[PDB]
Homo-oligomer: A and B are copies of this chain.
């Protein structure tokens, strides 16, 4: 996963690039979930990454987008 959130890139934009790479692999829902729990959080910028980790297990993409909106 080459996609990483720029320090000034809105989270939703990063999410869209991330999902574009994910779609290329025709990932299942299970894989999509694993990727959202791991790489999406791990590849987020400093500001966002901290917040996203604070959400805890099972946080949804929706909850992550809300947490880092702007």
Residues of A within 8 A of B (CB): 1, 27-28, 30-31, 34-35, 38-39, 42
Contacts and interface: CB of A to CB of B under 8 A. Distances in A.
Contacts of A35: 34, 38
Contact of A39 (B28, B31, B39): B39
Contacts of A34: 27, 31, 34-35
For this chain, the copies found in one complex come to 2
Interface of A is mostly: helix
Nearest to A39: B38
A42 B1 CA distance: 9
Contacts of A30: 28, 31
Contacts of A1: 38, 42
